[PDB]
Amino acid sequence: EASLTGAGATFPAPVYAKWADTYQKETGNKVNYQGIGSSGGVKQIIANTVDFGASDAPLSDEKLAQEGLFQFPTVIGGVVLAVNIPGLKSGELVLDGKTLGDIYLGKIKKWDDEAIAKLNPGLKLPSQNIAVVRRADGSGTSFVFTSYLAKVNEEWKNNVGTGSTVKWPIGLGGKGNDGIAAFVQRLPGAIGYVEYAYAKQNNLAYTKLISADGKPVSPTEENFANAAKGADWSKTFAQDLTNQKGEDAWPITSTTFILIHKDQKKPEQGTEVLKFFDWAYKTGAKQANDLDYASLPDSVVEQVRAAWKTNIKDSSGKPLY
Numbered sequence: 001e002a003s004l005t006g007a008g009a010t011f012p013a014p015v016y017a018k019w020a021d022t023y024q025k026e027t028g029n030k031v032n033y034q035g036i037g038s039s040g041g042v043k044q045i046i047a048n049t050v051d052f053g054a055s056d057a058p059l060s061d062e063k064l065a066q067e068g069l070f071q072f073p074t075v076i077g078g079v080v081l082a083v084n085i086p087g088l089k090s091g092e093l094v095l096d097g098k099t100l101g102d103i104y105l106g107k108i109k110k111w112d113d114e115a116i117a118k119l120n121p122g123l124k125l126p127s128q129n130i131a132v133v134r135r136a137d138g139s140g141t142s143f144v145f146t147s148y149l150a151k152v153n154e155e156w157k158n159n160v161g162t163g164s165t166v167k168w169p170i171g172l173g174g175k176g177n178d179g180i181a182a183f184v185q186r187l188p189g190a191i192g193y194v195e196y197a198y199a200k201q202n203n204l205a206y207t208k209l210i211s212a213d214g215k216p217v218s219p220t221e222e223n224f225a226n227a228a229k230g231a232d233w234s235k236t237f238a239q240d241l242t243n244q245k246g247e248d249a250w251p252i253t254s255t256t257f258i259l260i261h262k263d264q265k266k267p268e269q270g271t272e273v274l275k276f277f278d279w280a281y282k283t284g285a286k287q288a289n290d291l292d293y294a295s296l297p298d299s300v301v302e303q304v305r306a307a308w309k310t311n312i313k314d315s316s317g318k319p320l321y
Contacts, residue, residue, distance in 0.1 A: 002272035008041015008054030039138025053259035056140025058238035076294040079252040090205035097152025106170035133192030136173030225294035227253035267314035
């Protein structure tokens with residue numbers, strides 16, 4: 001029976017928490033996961049205060065090597081725009097990238113703005129102020145979201161850019177995915193970006209989005225998976241899943257990563273971390289798919305296992321997988 005600690009990304013926290021509960025039921029091993037955001041995850045694994053870190057934003061090969069870290073992906077999720085719009089039901093509103101960016105720039109202030117009406121010609125839109133919500137904490141969901149906005153809105157690209165933290169033009173700060181979900185629930189007229197489970201499991205309305213190919217798409221597990229079908233995983237785990245081509249490709253998709261040290265000073269901890277995630281790849285798909293996370297292809301799992309064997313060792317050089 002091991003007691004493991006992880007910290008970081010809230011984007012996959014629902015699935016990690018479910019996996020950890022199940023794992024403990026089945027094996028007795030205990031995994032404590034703190035959802036503090038990706039930036040904090042990276043800080044804590046570098047600091048050696050947890051057995052594993054978690055970040056939705058990948059570290060570069062060079063950064064990993066500088067820090068003695070190894071990164072591997074776990075699941076594929078999607079970022080949606082949770083909304084609180086009087087008189088509309090979930091999934092009714094469509095936004096495109098440009099107009100979403102104009103909302104986040106503060107250029108569009110009301111939900112019946114002409115640019116929104118044009119995207120939604122059959123819909124009766126209220127004269128409700130838009131209450132923009134964004135992350136307060138250093139966030140991989142923010143990194144994915146702003147990566148997307150930079151592709152689709154040039155003004156955003158040039159003035160705000162991409163980051164886990166940026167200088168938000170407008171918008172109230174929510175802590176974690178959970179914090180944004182709570183703000184959207186409490187604020188008539190809100191819009192906030194969250195990983196899909198945080199909308200669905202909180203019964204929040206959400207929008208459709210226009211795909212890179214120009215078609216309205218609903219956020220679903222399958223459509224997150226579709227956004228990754230063009231990914232050449234063999235080349236790198238650090239795949240960009242935003243604004244990808246193809247049918248039914250949800251435009252704000254991302255994988256998410258676990259970070260561990262290559263030289264495990266507590267090798268039994270490291271061994272057990274790998275056993276937990278290996279169990280999750282082998283047995284955890286229904287739990288992920290229940291929470292609308294798409295699973296990595298088997299070939300990717302096999303890449304991860306091969307890489308564990310060559311990268312994760314004790315201080316004497318012995319592999320821990």
